[PDB]
Structure formats: structure tokens, C-alpha cells
Design a protein around this ligand. Structure first.
Ligand SMILES: [Mg+2]
Lengths: 129, 83, 94, 149, 189
């Protein structure tokens, strides 16, 4: 069933941007969704998303742009110990020149660059690039 | 295709969508404030009835229930408009 | 059927199970539905059925067993006859 | 797609944004709690009350009119049933399947619909043991079941 | 004169007196009376808006709010006309408990209901502001900066009362909560 609500959503916003779809809604919604999408907003990977408030769960509607090649999700949230952060961002991103492993540490949800500035580890969620 | 303004969907194309599939989940049902010929009394019948709606008076019976909406009996009116 | 109504009378109302109490409650006149089963042997049938007619009490020959009655009473056990004194919200009485 | 069947259907109820009462309604939190009250008294299930109250009567949802949901109104006054209505509907069902299996020992079909039904019982039961509405002891038994209805 | 319909620890005369005196003035009035004896405010503030024409926000205990709603339309009409050049609106004085971190721990402390949590409060604050309009649905923007702008769909029944206000409400929580919101007057179902 709905186990992981990212994988759910991120499939459907990778899986639109292939078709070139202009915008998409994501059915279940969550806090973690919002908080990881707002990360994608900063590096440009999407445009402004506007969350509907069906009284229950939430829907979102994501303005897409052309720019997202793929976003995916590492499904079990392994615990990343900062020394490993490299070994991951080697084998999970296309280059050292862009690509963003979104993860979730002590000091909020954020990309790997921002966990490195603050010097924290924590749990991998996914990656967009 | 390539541009469907999902957030501002024109009123028609939610009514041709299954209740839970809509942008916001709303029902496709209603109550009706019902006259009936004998008594002037108005009962507050819910379209999709399930049970037989009897008159606040007594004798007459308003709504046989069927699959979807309720079958009003013979010659009796109703009033949607609200909310 | 008189599983559902009876069930409700047990919880809420008043009763007497079986015999002798039931017949006392007819004697007294304070019982106004005697539920016989089938399997009440046909003398007792006719002598309760008579002995209630005279009081002016409704009788029921429940399509039962002695047992399918016990089970229906939420009793766990053999009840041939019973008398209902007072119902709850149950419209067992007509 | 359902617990125990292939059919992957969806047909469910669906409320609006709005929750605030809809102004037809007279009654008030009291007169609804006066009415739930009299229906449960008469002998109806918490589902069945919610029913009577909407079709004939007026209340979209008790929950919105009063503070709490039907069961709590019965339970906080002590008209609530012994076990959950939701469960003895399965138990009553089981005992009905039992019966005709006991006359017709060929019905292979009835010998899921029993096994399934038994399993939808046990399954239910063992939260009612962790949510603690049932005491940690009660158990099915075929024999003692027919009585329990 | 002032202090009799504002009891909560908070006196500070200025408006609270003048506004409660206008409540007291509305008791010298047929039918708008007796039902007003039971009622009672707590505090009140003057707050300006972007346009210039400031609004008076009135707080209420909370259990009384559901009684203030019976009077509100008739109330506002009269004291808005009295205490002129200004908009008036009622809010319930909700508590907002802090979140129990492990830091701010669980030494004891009775629960902390959802009613009394954060996001329930500013949401019920919405239902207190636009009493006559009533909410039909929210959307919630995220601009490319990250600034979260809400959009509140209100109904239509008593739009006329509320349509002129709007940018008072926009001004209102932005003092109370700290959130920026504009109101839209839409289709039906
Ligand atoms: Mg299975």
C-alpha cells in the first residue's frame, strides 16, 4: 500500500517531466514532501508549487519547468555518517558539478551541500539532479 | 496535454469526475426540503435515503429507497438550494 | 423473526424461563407472551396454550427446539417454554 | 484492494470542506443527543442511528452537531453494546454460515466464507485486545459463539 | 462604565474602557439585551492596515464565542456605526501551548490537545474573523523565494458584509500570527 509517500510523489514528478507535462498534482501530500520540494525550488529544479488543503491529507500542484532530469528516492532512509556522504554522492549523482542528495538532519531537511556547511550527517531521503 | 491549469478547473469538468477524484473532495449528494400533498409539514429528506422516510404527521410515506437517489412518492416537491 | 426481538427483551425487559415459574406468571396474570417451542411435548403445549387462552395472553410456537430458544435467549441452554412479563424498547408484544 | 477478495473497488462517502452546521437544522447538540439516545434505547446499532438521523431527520453528521461521535455519546452514558457492533456483525454472520454448513456438509464455498469470516473475526479481535475494549481473554469458540449473539 | 465587561487580569483603560462602554451603551436597547448580559470580552487592540483605515480587533473568552456569533452581525452593525471610521471583528482568546520538545520535556504536564496546539489555533482564528462568509477551501502558495502565502476561498452568503473588509483580515493575522493572506470570491458546486 502507500508505504512511502515520497516515492509515490517523486515518481509522479519525475514521470511527468519526461512527458514534458507543464504541471502535476501529487495525491497524498505530506510535510516531508513540502519540505523536500522547497529544497528543489532553490536550486531551480522546479517552479512554485501551490498546496491544496483538502481537509484530510493534502494535494499539491507543482509548476515544473524543463529542468528536472530525474528525482528519485532511497527507500530505506539509511543513516549517512558524513564520511560516507562522499561515497554516496559519488555513486548516486551524475557529476561532482551539480546534483543534490536531499537528506534530513538534526538541523532540518536540506541538500548535501548545506549539511556539509553545517557539518552534520543524517538520513538520506532521495536525490534530484 | 502539456497545459491543464489543474488548480482552476472549469466548473463543468469537476462534475464529470468521480467525487473523490476532484481537486477537493466534495460529495455528489443533497438534502431536499419536501412538501407532500396532505400535510403542510416539511421533512428534511436526504436524497440518498437508505431508509423509508415517513411523514412527521403519519399516514403517507415519502421516499421508497432505491440504488442511488430516493424514489419520491407520486406527487411531492423538494428544495435543493443551500450552503 | 423472533431472534432479534427476543435478544433485546432478555437484555432490557423481564422474564421467566421454562415452566412453573411461567405457569405461575400466567396464574398471577402478569405475563403476556408465552413462547413455547416445538418439542414442548404435546400435553404441555395444550395445557399451557389452554392455560394462557383463559388468561388472555398471546402464545408463540416458535419454530424452535427446546434449544433454538435457549440459544436465542442468550442463555446457553435448554428452555422449552418461556414467559415475557415486560419488554424493553423491543416490540415483541403486538 | 480489499482484505479478502479480488475486487479492487472504491465506493465511499465523502464530506465537504465545510463542517459548521448547515442552518436548516434546528435541534442543537442537545436535541440530537436526546434523539440518538431514544433510538439506541429502542435497540439500534451506532451505524443504524447515524442512518435514521440523516435520511428522515436532519443531521448530516452527528459529530459536527454535537462535540463527539455517536459511540462516545452512547458510551459516556452507558447505552453502548457489550462488544463492538462492528465485530458481532461478523460473529452473527459466522454463526449463520455455521448453521447451514451443519445441515449441508457439501458446500465447499461456505467453507471459505466461514474460514475467511473466522479470520476477519480474529483479526479484528486482536486489536480490540490492544485497544483494550475487550478483556485479554475472550476468544472465539464455535460453541459459545451462537450464544454471544 | 468600562471595567465590568472586560475581566481577565488585563485592565489598560484606553480603548478597552471606551469599547466596553459601547457594549454597555448597546444594553440600553430593546431585544439587544439580556443575551448581552451573559457575554463578556477579555482584551482589545487597535491595529492599522496598509490602506490606512485602522481596525479594532476584539477578543472573547472562547465558550462565549459561540454565543457572540448569534449577536455578531447585529453587534458589529451598531458599534461600527457608533465607534466610527473603523472596522470591527471578533476573535476567540485561544491559549496556544508550546510544543513539548525533549528539551522542553515531559516532567508532568497534562497532555496538550490538538484544539490547543499551534496550527489549530491560527486556523480557528480564520473561522472567527470571517464569521459571515465562512471558509469553503484554502490553497497555499509557495513563492520562488519560499514565502508561504495562503489563499482563502470564502463562500458568498454574507459576502456583501465581508467584501469591503478583506484587507483588514489581511492586516489582522499579520499582527496576531505572522502570515500573509488574500481572499478570493469564487464558483459553486
Ligand atoms: Mg491477504
Amino acid at each position: 500500500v502507500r508505504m512511502n509517500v515520497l516515492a509515490d510523489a517523486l515518481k509522479s514528478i519525475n514521470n511527468a517531466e519526461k512527458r514534458g507535462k507543464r504541471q502535476v498534482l501529487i495525491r497524498p501530500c505530506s510535510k516531508v514532501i513540502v519540505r523536500f520540494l522547497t529544497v528543489m525550488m532553490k536550486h531551480g529544479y522546479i517552479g512554485e508549487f501551490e498546496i491544496i488543503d483538502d481537509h484530510r491529507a493534502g494535494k499539491i500542484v507543482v509548476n515544473l519547468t524543463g529542468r528536472l532530469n530525474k528525482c528519485g528516492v532511497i527507500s530505506p532512509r539509511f543513516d549517512v555518517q558524513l564520511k560516507d556522504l562522499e561515497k554516496w554522492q559519488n555513486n548516486l549523482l551524475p557529476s561532482r558539478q551539480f546534483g543534490f542528495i536531499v537528506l534530513t538532519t538534526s538541523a532540518g531537511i536540506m541538500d548535501h551541500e548545506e549539511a556539509r556547511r553545517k557539518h552534520t550527517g543524517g538520513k538520506i531521503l532521495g536525490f534530484f539532479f | 496535454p502539456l497545459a491543464k491549469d489543474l488548480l482552476h478547473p472549469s466548473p463543468e469538468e469537476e462534475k464529470r469526475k468521480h467525487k473523490k477524484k476532484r481537486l477537493v473532495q466534495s460529495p455528489n449528494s443533497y438534502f431536499m426540503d419536501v412538501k407532500c400533498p396532505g400535510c403542510y409539514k416539511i421533512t428534511t429528506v436526504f436524497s440518498h435515503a437508505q431508509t423509508v422516510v415517513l411523514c412527521v404527521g403519519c399516514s403517507t410515506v415519502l421516499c421508497q429507497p432505491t440504488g442511488g437517489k430516493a424514489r419520491l412518492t407520486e406527487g411531492c416537491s423538494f428544495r435543493r438550494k443551500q450552503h | 423473526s423472533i431472534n432479534s426481538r427476543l435478544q433485546l427483551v432478555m437484555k432490557s425487559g423481564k422474564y421467566v424461563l421454562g415452566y412453573k415459574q411461567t405457569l405461575k406468571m400466567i396464574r398471577q396474570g402478569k405475563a403476556k407472551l408465552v413462547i413455547l417451542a416445538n418439542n414442548c411435548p404435546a400435553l404441555r403445549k395444550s395445557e399451557i396454550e389452554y392455560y394462557a387462552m383463559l388468561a388472555k395472553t398471546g402464545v408463540h410456537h416458535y419454530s424452535g427446539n427446546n434449544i433454538e430458544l435457549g440459544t436465542a435467549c442468550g442463555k446457553y441452554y435448554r428452555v422449552c417454554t418461556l414467559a415475557i412479563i415486560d419488554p424493553g424498547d423491543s416490540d415483541i408484544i403486538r | 484492494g480489499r482484505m479478502h477478495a479480488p475486487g479492487k473497488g472504491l465506493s465511499q462517502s465523502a464530506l465537504p470542506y465545510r463542517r459548521s452546521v448547515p442552518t436548516w437544522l434546528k435541534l442543537t447538540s442537545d436535541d440530537v443527543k436526546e434523539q440518538i439516545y431514544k433510538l439506541a434505547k429502542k435497540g439500534l446499532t451506532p451505524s443504524q442511528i447515524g442512518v435514521i438521523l440523516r435520511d428522515s431527520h436532519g443531521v448530516a453528521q452527528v459529530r459536527f452537531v454535537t462535540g463527539n461521535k455517536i459511540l462516545r455519546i452512547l458510551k459516556s452514558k452507558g447505552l453502548a453494546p457489550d462488544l463492538p457492533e462492528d465485530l458481532y456483525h461478523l460473529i452473527k454472520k459466522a454463526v449463520a454460515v455455521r448453521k447451514h454448513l451443519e445441515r449441508n456438509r457439501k458446500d465447499k464455498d461456505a467453507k471459505f466464507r466461514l474460514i475467511l469470516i473466522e479470520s476477519r473475526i480474529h483479526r479484528l479481535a486482536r486489536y480490540y485486545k490492544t485497544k483494550r475494549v475487550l478483556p485479554p481473554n475472550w476468544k472465539y469458540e464455535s460453541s459459545t459463539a451462537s450464544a454471544l449473539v | 462604565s468600562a471595567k465590568i465587561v472586560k475581566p481577565n487580569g488585563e485592565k489598560p483603560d484606553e480603548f478597552e474602557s471606551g469599547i466596553s462602554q459601547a457594549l454597555l451603551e448597546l444594553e440600553m436597547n430593546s431585544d439587544l439585551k439580556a443575551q448581552l448580559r451573559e457575554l463578556n470580552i477579555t482584551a482589545a487592540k487597535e491595529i492599522e492596515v496598509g490602506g490606512g483605515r485602522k481596525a479594532i480587533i476584539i477578543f472573547v473568552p472562547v465558550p462565549q464565542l459561540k454565543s457572540f456569533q448569534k449577536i455578531q452581525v447585529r453587534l458589529v452593525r451598531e458599534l461600527e456605526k457608533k465607534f466610527s471610521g473603523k472596522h470591527v471583528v471578533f476573535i476567540a482568546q485561544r491559549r496556544i501551548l508550546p510544543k513539548p520538545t525533549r528539551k522542553s520535556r515531559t516532567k508532568n504536564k497534562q497532555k496538550r490537545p490538538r484544539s490547543r496546539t499551534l496550527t489549530a489555533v491560527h486556523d480557528a482564528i480564520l473561522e472567527d474573523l470571517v464569521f459571515p462568509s465562512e471558509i469553503v477551501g484554502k490553497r497555499i502558495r509557495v513563492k520562488l523565494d519560499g514565502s508561504r502565502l495562503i489563499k482563502v476561498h470564502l463562500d458568498k452568503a454574507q459576502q456583501n458584509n465581508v467584501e469591503h473588509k478583506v484587507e483588514t483580515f489581511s492586516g489582522v493575522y499579520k499582527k496576531l500570527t505572522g502570515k500573509d493572506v488574500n481572499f478570493e470570491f469564487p464558483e459553486f458546486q
